[PDB]
Amino acid sequence: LVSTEAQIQKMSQDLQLEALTIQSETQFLTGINSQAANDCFKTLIAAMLSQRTMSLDFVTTNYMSLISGMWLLTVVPNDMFIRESLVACQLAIINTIIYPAFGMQRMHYRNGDPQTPFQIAEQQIQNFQVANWLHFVNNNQFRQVVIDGVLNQVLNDNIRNGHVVNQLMEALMQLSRQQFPTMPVDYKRSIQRGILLLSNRLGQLVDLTRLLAYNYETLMACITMNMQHVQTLTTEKLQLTSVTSLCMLIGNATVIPSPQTLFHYYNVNVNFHSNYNERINDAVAIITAANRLNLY
Amino acid sequence: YPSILHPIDHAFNEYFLQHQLVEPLNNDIIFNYIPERIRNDVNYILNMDRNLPSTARYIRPNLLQDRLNLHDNFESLWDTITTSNYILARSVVPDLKELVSTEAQIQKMSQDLQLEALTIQSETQFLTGINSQAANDCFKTLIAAMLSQRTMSLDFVTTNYMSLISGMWLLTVVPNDMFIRESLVACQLAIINTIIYPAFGMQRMHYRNGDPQTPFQIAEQQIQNFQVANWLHFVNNNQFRQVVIDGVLNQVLNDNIRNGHVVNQLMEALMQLSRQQFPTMPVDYKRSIQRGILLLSNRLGQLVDLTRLLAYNYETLMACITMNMQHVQTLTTEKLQLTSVTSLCMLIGNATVIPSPQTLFHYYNVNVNFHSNYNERINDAVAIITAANRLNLYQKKMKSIVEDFLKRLQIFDISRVPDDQMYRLRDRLRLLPVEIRRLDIFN
Amino acid sequence: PAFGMQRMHYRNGDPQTPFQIAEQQIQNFQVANWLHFVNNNQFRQVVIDGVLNQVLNDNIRNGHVVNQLMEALMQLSRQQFPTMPVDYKRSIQRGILLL
Amino acid sequence: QKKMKSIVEDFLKRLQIFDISRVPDDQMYRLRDRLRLLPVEIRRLDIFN
Amino acid sequence: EIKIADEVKKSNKEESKQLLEVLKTKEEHQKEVQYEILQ
């Protein structure tokens, strides 16, 4: 990875957090770590192979953990997160970064609405670079397909190619040139340099999502059980503070699953799925045989 | 499940099964429990983690309004029930942060006043009683008295021309039907005879007590300047507006007080009192009242930002009440020193404080717990006052079942309430209808 | 305060500096010429011997800028103003004489 | 198979004012995208051909 | 004492030390007027 003492010492210079009026001065850069970048690479894949819902945990004061929430929505499909935590993240991005940029009014949103806030501001906004990134994030889900017997939820062709981040860079560079027509000059200049810490990392963020969509694709081959998708009851909490620790700490070192690892995740899945079907056949054959013999 | 029950026994046990007090719970009904003026507010972001199954149920409380009318002829019971809300609404309203420092403000207030070390003058007492602790106290007892409708009472000295100029800011923002009338008139008379009637040269008014008109209602007819008769008309016709929002009747402020545009109608009035010559007064009286009117007129940027902050922390905390707020003058008035109003207007700057959502869900959960306890001790006592008249118990006296209704309400005391206020309180509990879960269990 | 008009209502983040918005309000002539020079004080980018370096105006080089400023401080020291007391007038009028 | 981080790191270190420990790998691989589009000098181009 | 705020009394500046001395020679003049009437 990139050395964590050289990134934070550079990231604290572009934001200039001391000169602002900010209560959490030493709290913007708490979650950047080397042990917390490996967590959001494992949480993001393993809650996508087993169709597990995934809530969001963030602080709406901290705008740097909110800009790295723009990359999370454009890659991970929208039906993965619980709706009350996807709307609460999509509303905080619009009502702080996007709508103060173009000078529009704050978005009055009612919680009993069929339309997510990235579907309302996809029409009421009048740019083209921002209104085309909002069209991809509204229309990325899992496309169901049946490969070699089993159903498996597969990503679209545009994320596995890594080409979407070339559109997010163009929607984030033009949002950095906008004059925020009411924001104070001290707070506006720090939210324009927190954006350029991610627009200037284009070549090593396309190179992430080509790997994040390849480790999921080559581990999905050894899934013997069916990959059905419903909303669970408990959710694995993903922290947007530590998604910031992944987008700007990755390097040019690709890792693929080892073939001894890839043959062990297969043999655990076949041994559990064949055991699930050898207990059903033994619990039916007793329930039925107790009813034929007239055993009250 | 089968049973063996008597036909009288089965009629009781069937009634417990059909009439259960449970209702299904979802995700769209947790968010509807929050009041509508918070989940529509654009300052708070609402997020939740788990989604509940189709099994889960919840018991809804009954928040229906006051059926006894304790603000009508019950004037000693209403005083305890509105002092209790005032201490609760005082420990919820937030305290100011990042004030202008006190030492850097009295050093600037001592060079604008130009106070000399040899002559004794009235510009020395403009400096009394300002500090960072009394500026934090006037902000609380203005918001917490408005949410509880406690009557206020001004306290000041008339030899201080700075508690009278900054007292022109209370009467133009806080409505005049809230201060007690023996202290509202005695402050409006000190503004009239000192600031404004010497500023135009006319003779100061000889005001006898007991007049039907306050001295701001009798001076707009006598005065002939225009821009000080627009301010003097807004002070007279300042009232709350009783509107019913989301079931509860609550009293909203004016539409100009919420904008902060009242101060721009005030800083044209006292910008004109500092332009007139004082013809009948000596020269040292024109100067010692034009310097005190200048310390308020350099804060025109900071006083529009202060009126917009009282009118917002009163709007957000008003959504967290459930009981009906009525407008009745109480017995005991909660005091407000007029020197701490002066300490607030020239110490605040450039730091918005809004109430945190972890104290909006706690100020709401106490106002539902008291209201759903007050409404379920009515039904426990109406259903026995009525059941001891249908059963014809002519030898029973109903003091011992109103004495356990005032006691189980936790905020009252019993050694103060006499017997006259208890056999008359059951004259109101007799006319109410019995709740429909207690009526079929008696029939 | 020198002309007696009401002090300006400025909020942060406005696209105009207070000197770009006070030359529209003040209808004096010798002090609205100085605010027009301050708002249009820029560097002039020329290339000389291949090197792009930035030159000041021909009036900052001459020193004729101060003859426009001291024509504006002299008239502003003569304006009497009614909304302020007499000693606040006399303390600005003393610090403007040291310059 | 070669990666060009080690010769942009030597390019900043050969200048005297910049320090290496404050420049991450973002700002060092973005710099060689501006060093590719430049034409090579005529003395070094004729000795490489 | 003077009963002015406590961050002005314990402060060590020049604009805040003079303010304590001017409010100290206003008391000695107000007590000088009240004493001359009583004689």
Numbering used by the authors:
A (entry chain H): 346 to 641
B (entry chain I): 248 to 690
C (entry chain G): 445 to 543
D (entry chain G): 642 to 690
E (entry chain K): 61 to 99
Paper passage:
This core domain can further be divided into the fingers, palm, and thumb subdomains, with the active site located between the fingers and palm. An atomic model was built based on this high-resolution in situ structure, with distinct side chain densities and RNA features. We determined that the RdRp is attached to CSP decamers at a specific, off-centered location, as previously described.
Thus, the RdRps in these DLPs existed mainly in a duplex-open state (DOS) compared to TES. Compared with other resolved reovirus RdRp structures, the rotavirus RdRp’ N-terminal domain possesses an additional subdomain that has a helix-loop-helix structural feature (residues 31–69, HLH subdomain) near the cap-binding site. This HLH subdomain extends towards the genomic (+) strand in DOS and retracts from RNA in TES.
